[PDB]
Amino acid sequence: DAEFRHDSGYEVHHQKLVFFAEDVGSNKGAIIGLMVG
Amino acid sequence: DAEFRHDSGYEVHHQKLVFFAEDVGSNKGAIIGLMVG
Amino acid sequence: DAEFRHDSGYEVHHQKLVFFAEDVGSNKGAIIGLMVG
Amino acid sequence: DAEFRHDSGYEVHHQKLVFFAEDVGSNKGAIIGLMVG
Amino acid sequence: DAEFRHDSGYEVHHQKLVFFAEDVGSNKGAIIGLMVG
Amino acid sequence: DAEFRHDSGYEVHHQKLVFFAEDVGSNKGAIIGLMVG
Amino acid sequence: DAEFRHDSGYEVHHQKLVFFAEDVGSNKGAIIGLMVG
Amino acid sequence: DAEFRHDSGYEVHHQKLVFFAEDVGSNKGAIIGLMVG
Amino acid sequence: DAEFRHDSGYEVHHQKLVFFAEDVGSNKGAIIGLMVG
Amino acid sequence: DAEFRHDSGYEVHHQKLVFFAEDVGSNKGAIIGLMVG
Amino acid sequence: DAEFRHDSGYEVHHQKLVFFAEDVGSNKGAIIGLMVG
Amino acid sequence: DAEFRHDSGYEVHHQKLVFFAEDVGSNKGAIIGLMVG
């Protein structure tokens, strides 16, 4: 939950790849299967 | 929940790929299966 | 829940791909199956 | 729930793909199956 | 619930695809099956 | 949950790859299978 | 697309919750945004 | 797409929770954003 | 896509929790963002 | 995509928890972000 | 993608926990970010 | 992707815990960030 920015200037390339992944496939902070008695 | 920006200037390329993924397939903060008694 | 922007200048390319995915398939903040007594 | 913009300038390409997905298939903030007594 | 815009300038391409999906198949904020007593 | 930025100046390259992955496939802080009695 | 059954015998409980969800919020087998030329 | 069954015999409990979820929030087999030329 | 069964005999318990999740939040077999030229 | 079964006989317990999770939050076999030219 | 079974006989216990997790949070076989030219 | 079985006979215990985890949080066979030119 925060800003993403890819600001480009003078670029001359043949292949480029900019990949920002904050959570791709994470049970991040997931309480899975808790039980309390 | 935040801004995304891809501002482009002078670019000369053959292939390019800009992928921003904040949550792709995450049970992020999901309480799954809680039980309390 | 925030702005998305893809502003383009002078671009010369053969293939390009701009993919912004904030939530694609996330039970994000989903309380699934809670029980309290 | 926020603005989307794809403003284009001088572009010369063969294939391009701009995909913004804020929620595609997310039970996002969905309380599913809560029970309280 | 926000503005969408695809403003185009000088574009020369063979295939293009602009897809904005804010909610496609999300029980987003849906309280499903709540019970309180 | 923090800012990402890739601001570019004068770049001349043949291949480039910028990959920021904060959580890719982590049960990060996930309580999985807790039981208390 | 198949049968569901919850047949009950002698049950004595204080809280119970039987939730069968085959597809809740899934773009399941959905071709979204295909393009062919 | 298959049968679900919860057949109950003599049960004496204080809390119980039977949750079958075959697909809850999955882009399962979803071709999202394909492009071919 | 297969059968689920929870057949119960003589059970005496205070808390119980039976959770079968075949796909909960998985882009399972989802081609996301393919491009071919 | 296969059968699940929890068949119960004579059980006397205070807490029990049976959790079968085949895919919970996996981009399992997901081609994410492929590009070919 | 295979059978799961928890068949129970004569059991006398105070706490028990049977957790089968085939994929919980795995980008298992996920090609993430491929590029070919 | 193979069978799981926990078949129980005459058991008398105070605590027991049977946990089978084939992949819990593994980028198992995931090509992450490949680039070819």
Domain assignments of chain E as residue spans, ordered by start = 1-37
Chain I residues touching C21 at Cβ < 8 A: 32
Q: For residue C1, with 0-12 CB atoms within 10 Å meaning exposed, 13-18 middle and 19 or more buried, which class applies?
A: middle
Closest partner residue to C8 among D8, D20, D28, by Cβ? D8
Compute the 3-state secondary structure of chain G and give helix, strand, coil in percent, each to the nearest 5.
0, 40, 60
Scored b (16 or more CB within 10 A) or e, E1-37 reads eeeeeeeeeeeeeebbbbbbbbbbbbbbebebbeeee
**Angle ∠(C28,I31,J20) on CA atoms, nearest 5:** 50
Given CB atoms, is G8 within the 8 Å cutoff of chain C? no
- The rounded distance, in Å, linking the Cα atoms of I30 and K5 is 28
> Sign of torsion, CA H12 H13 H14 H19?
negative
Residues of C whose CB is below 8 A from G18: none
Nearest to I35 by CA among J33, E19, B25: J33
The answer to whether the CB of H26 falls within 8 A of the CB of I26 is yes
The C-alpha angle with vertex I21 and arms to F31 and I30, in degrees rounded to 5, equals 100
- Of C28, I25, B32, nearest to A33 by C-alpha is B32
**Contacts with A27 from chain B: Cβ below 8 Å:** 26-28, 30
Handedness of CA E1, E2, E7, E12 (dihedral sign): negative
Strands (E), chain K: 4-5, 11-12, 18-24, 31-32
How big, in percent rounded to 5, are the helix, strand and coil portions of chain E? 0, 40, 60
Verify whether the Cβ–Cβ distance H15 to B33 is below 8 Å: no
Q: Which two tokens stand for residue E13?
A: 């391409």
Using the Cβ of F25 and the Cβ atoms of chain K, whether some distance falls under 8 Å is answered with yes
Q: How far apart are CA C11 and CA D7, in angstroms?
A: 13
CA–CA separation, C5 vs C2, rounded Å? 10
Q: Does A8 touch chain K (CB under 8 A)?
A: no
Are C16 and D15 in contact by the 8 Å Cβ rule? The answer is yes
CA distance D12 to D33: 51
Give contacts of F1 with chain A, Cβ < 8 Å. Answer: 1-2, 22
Contacts of residue J23 in chain B, CB cutoff 8 Å?
Answer: none
Would you call I17 an interface residue with chain A, using a CB distance cutoff of 8 Å?
yes
Give the neighbours of chain L: at least 3 Cβ pairs within 8 Å: A, F, K
Resolution in A: 3.0
Q: Which two tokens stand for residue H28?
A: 């399962």
User: What residues contact H29, with CB distance under 8 A and at least 6 apart?
Assistant: G28, G29, I28, I29, I30
Say if F37 is an interface residue toward chain J (CB within 8 Å): yes
Nearest to F19 by CA among J35, A20, A8: A20
Q: What angle do CA B32, F31, D29 make, to 5 degrees?
A: 35
Cβ contact L–D (≥3 pairs, < 8 Å): no
Residue A19 corresponds to which amino acid? F
Residue G33's nearest CA partner among C26, B24, D24, J36 is D24
F25 Rama sector, left if φ>0, alpha if ψ -120 to 50, beta otherwise: left
The alpha carbon of residue F36 is apart from the nearest alpha carbon of chain L, in Å, by 12
CA distance I15 to H29: 36
Chain H residue numbers with beta carbons less than 8 Å from the beta carbon of C25 are 25-27
CA distance B5 to A24: 20
Angle CA(L35)–CA(E14)–CA(A21) in degrees, nearest 5? Answer: 35
- C10: left (phi > 0), else alpha (psi -120 to 50), else beta? beta
Q: Where are the beta strands (DSSP E) in chain E?
A: 4-5, 11-12, 18-24, 31-32
Task: Give the list of residues 6+ apart from residue D37 with CB closer than 8 angstroms, or none.
Answer: C36, C37, E37, G14, G15
CA distance L13 to chain K (A): 5
K32 Cβ under 8 Å from any chain A Cβ: yes
Q: Touching check for K29 and chain B: CB below 8 Å?
A: no
Q: Which CATH superfamily is domain I1-37 in?
A: Amyloidogenic glycoprotein, amyloid-beta peptide (4.10.230.10)
- F29 in contact with L at a CB cutoff of 8 Å? no
